[PDB]
Amino acid sequence: MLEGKVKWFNSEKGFGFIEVEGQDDVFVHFSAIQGEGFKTLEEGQAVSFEIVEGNRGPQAANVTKEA
């Protein structure tokens, strides 16, 4: 897994970006968010995740919020 920080997220629209030092930022859609409750994220949140790339390019997957 990769580790990152939520750079920003639009709760109403349900997407945003994960910052990772070193690599480019990673687009994250709310469907990638793991766990219970309403799928959303806050700026600066610690997350673990994977990058998945199909014909639309890379985006986050398997996003878990961490302490």
Side-chain angles (χ1 to χ4, degrees), residues 1-20 22-67:
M1 306 290 294
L2 312 171
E3 283 174 353
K5 220 162 69 174
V6 174
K7 189 180 181 197
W8 55 271
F9 195 80
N10 192 323
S11 184
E12 297 277 36
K13 308 186 108 298
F15 68 102
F17 280 91
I18 303 177
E19 198 192 359
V20 155
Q23 290 206 8
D24 306 307
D25 301 347
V26 182
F27 177 89
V28 57
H29 184 256
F30 73 83
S31 64
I33 303 175
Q34 301 299 297
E36 300 297 287
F38 187 75
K39 310 242 195 59
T40 195
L41 293 167
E42 314 182 1
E43 157 171 300
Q45 186 122 50
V47 296
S48 58
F49 67 106
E50 284 170 316
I51 306 173
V52 61
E53 169 161 356
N55 59 13
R56 201 153 173 193
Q59 63 179 124
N62 261 48
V63 173
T64 306
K65 307 188 218 183
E66 309 273 350

